[PDB]
Design a protein around this nucleic acid. Sequence first.
DNA 1: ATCAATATCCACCTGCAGATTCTACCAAAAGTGTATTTGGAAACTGCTCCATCAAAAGGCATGTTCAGCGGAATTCCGCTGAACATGCCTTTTGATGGAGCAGTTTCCAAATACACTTTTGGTAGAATCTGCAGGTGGATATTGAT
DNA 2: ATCAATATCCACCTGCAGATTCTACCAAAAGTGTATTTGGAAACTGCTCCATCAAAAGGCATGTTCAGCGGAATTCCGCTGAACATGCCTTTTGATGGAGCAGTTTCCAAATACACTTTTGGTAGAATCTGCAGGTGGATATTGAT
Lengths: 93, 96, 100, 100, 107, 108, 82, 81
Amino acid sequence: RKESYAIYVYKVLKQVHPDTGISSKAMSIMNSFVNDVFERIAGEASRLAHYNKRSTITSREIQTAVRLLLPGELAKHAVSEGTKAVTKYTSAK
Amino acid sequence: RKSRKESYAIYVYKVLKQVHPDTGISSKAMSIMNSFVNDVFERIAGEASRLAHYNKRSTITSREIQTAVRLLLPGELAKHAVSEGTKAVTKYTSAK
Amino acid sequence: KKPHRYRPGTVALREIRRYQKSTELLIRKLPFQRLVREIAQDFKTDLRFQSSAVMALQEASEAYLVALFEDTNLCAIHAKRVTIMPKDIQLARRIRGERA
Amino acid sequence: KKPHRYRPGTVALREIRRYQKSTELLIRKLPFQRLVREIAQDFKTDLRFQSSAVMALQEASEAYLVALFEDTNLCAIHAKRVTIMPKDIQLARRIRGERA
Amino acid sequence: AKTRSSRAGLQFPVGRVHRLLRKGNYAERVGAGAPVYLAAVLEYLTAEILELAGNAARDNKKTRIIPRHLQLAVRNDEELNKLLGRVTIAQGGVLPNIQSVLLPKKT
Amino acid sequence: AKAKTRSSRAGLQFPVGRVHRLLRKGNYAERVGAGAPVYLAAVLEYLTAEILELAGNAARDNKKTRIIPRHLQLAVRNDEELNKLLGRVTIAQGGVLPNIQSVLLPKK
Amino acid sequence: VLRDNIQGITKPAIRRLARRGGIKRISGLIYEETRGVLKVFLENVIRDAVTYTEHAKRKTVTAMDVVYALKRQGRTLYGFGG
Amino acid sequence: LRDNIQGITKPAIRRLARRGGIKRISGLIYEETRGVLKVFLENVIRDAVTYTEHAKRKTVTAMDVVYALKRQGRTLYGFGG
DNA sequence: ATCAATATCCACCTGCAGATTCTACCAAAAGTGTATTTGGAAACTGCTCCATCAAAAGGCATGTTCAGCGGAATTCCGCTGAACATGCCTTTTGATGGAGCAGTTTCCAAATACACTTTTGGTAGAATCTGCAGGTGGATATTGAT
DNA sequence: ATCAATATCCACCTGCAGATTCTACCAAAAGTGTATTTGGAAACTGCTCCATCAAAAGGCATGTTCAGCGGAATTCCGCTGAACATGCCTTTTGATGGAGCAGTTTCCAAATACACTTTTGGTAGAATCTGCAGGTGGATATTGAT
């Protein structure tokens, strides 16, 4: 059983362009893209944590990782959605 | 209560005297060597880490450190690093 | 009076627009595969290849070469030329850190 | 008296010989420290700097520039000059990927 | 029983991302807010690239996004271009771009 | 006392117990074989010996007995392999190798 | 017995690559240089790929082997599983 | 009567150039260099300060700088780590 | 070729900043012995997909001819950078309060760990469906000879 | 500029393979619900070492003169682009045997998990020690002018 972000890429796809599809090769690239950024952010968080003698990765290191890794405007927006999602997940069980 | 600050300095020095018995080394040079050792350690360890993950393994053995070295070091340097490493693991295993 | 001939350089520009517009691999598929198997073989014998592994190498290789020619073109133009030469490729690789 | 004068390039050559021999930082410290602090002020206010942190930054910057001056020279020479120019630094940075 | 993705208001799998973080051995521990934040960011980024690839498809009068569309969208956006500065999108081609001095005539 | 260090066993100057400790705590994997830190320390020691061996010569060549940063830089950049391995490393206070593009030399 | 396959990288294929690369005029010596440059690129990627293969004790080079090798070299590839 | 980037003077930029093997320098190089130096420092300092704020400090440490340099692929030996 | 002006060397000298040897106090390692647990190789094997031999055919490589115009060599001159001596303002060195960097103690929100229960993202397989490549024609440039 | 040879542009069109559409199986996730453990935030504090100010130190800003480099102009040869004839080898559609990757159970050698004992590398403060960077002198190589 090999997992992939396809259904999630597809969901988000329908939110931004309701009538557009995606070829499988393009979905393959999208899946590589998600795994790539994922590893990059986590790796960044990993080191960040170690550099600070911390054994726990929290929403806070993920945030710095994002500021360290992403270009100007993209960081600004990812940090917002990130904060936003955490606060909302917090306000509920 | 001034907490420790480990470093490879004493071992670097020990090694220095085996190679150049009558040679010394300055503080700044020692700091660089220390940086050198941590750097290779991270690079080699890091690569071994990925090797394991790729092959769905939970354990980093001398096997992974070896392939890590072959992927990391340039030809001849890797050749000797592999033998030195195999030598140490052998000698170690063969001892009470 | 009879024959029609494009001037040197017109077809070359026509071609750049053509190729910059598409994405298909430009090296013949099989010949590329034999090259892979030869280089691989002279490293380790009795090796087999997933077809996609050969395709992944061709995709990487062509993207690397196309990006290298861009760099080379800039090196030639830097010398006030429009013809790329070996030394332009060498300069670009030396600065890229592939022999710096 | 016998107004001794060295020809253009002789002292320069003499300087390359000297600086390639030594390792001292070539930018004056205080001015460099001011620049570092000023640029940092834009990222966060009321910051302090370990002495060692500024020295690390200066060592890193000079080594970076000296190397960029190396590829730059190569670009000038590629264009048959002995005089480096902006087009030369710009080409080098572009190929280094800090550029097209 | 609500999924952690819905509690966070996300499409991306919070449970899966939290799981991949643990298995990837990045630290001894992983806080619960970490995967929520990381899936938000991952989701936000795929939304940006699909937003842009979709326009490129539209521009080429196509309905299905293909690799070339992803490539156009990435290389035409300064930030994505930088984030993927050392990435190769298979079957993506390059952006049409002929250096001026190479064009004919004289004006 | 009958308590011999793993380093002495592997016959190495570098600290096996420490390399082991550092691997476990670096979050590189769930588990760590017993030979990995031995192998790894052996490799760290060897490279350390290679550089000190060359930096040392570089010092003798300058009629100096104490190795300084300059010496490590001269050692590393004059050696094709060490140079590649440290292709993206800056040795503080090391300078560059004396080198002048021929075309820039005076017309003899 | 594969021997001189570097010649399968024909003059017309090298020329097309130069075109996508935005190149208008090519010196006669460019073709052999390019082949030389490609052989080295390939030797390096295949060496690391084949090393991941053997570490896995496999006889078949997989796309992941190639993808992991490419990533090592800073030439990350999207599209084949990584 | 004092702009900081101009504190990085011509004589100094010339010495650097020399260490790099440069024999003749165009006048426009000095200003071009500062601009490059400035982009360099902003990129590195930004990352260092990000490591400073993460650790909740008000002092940039050589380590914050070393880590930033390592990220930019400009690894530096001699100042820790 | 011939000095004359400078820069560069080399052998020697010595003061001190930084390397060293010294000794102890000790928490944190690192080694050791016992009990418990488990990753992952060995072994059997189902099954994907790799290598390969086959055959037909036209897309595309090869090799040639011909001459347009790009590269490169040479001449030449306006100008801009190199060298330099003039004059001094900024950097650098060494001494002194205080802000934070850390070391300790504490304790509470938060993160395992474990047991069930429940929702679901794969997928093997079938059947249905749709965007679009790719063939066609003919209308709109673009080129290049005159 | 008028004109003929060609390539580009492009909306229309339809076979097909690649994509969307179930239906079902479902076991590995992902979630819910106690019990147990603990990391690191938070408040307090001591000692660095960093920012600051003064004075002694030495590098840079500045204007002049002209050497020589860079680039404009001119020139010619030959190499590289276009066009064309010829024909092979890649590519394409298919099938086949079997290598070998990967699923599954089995079980031990190696690893984790405390608990206890011993060694030791790092730190602090004191005293002792030394490699060598500049400083001098005098010889001599280098460079630039006649």
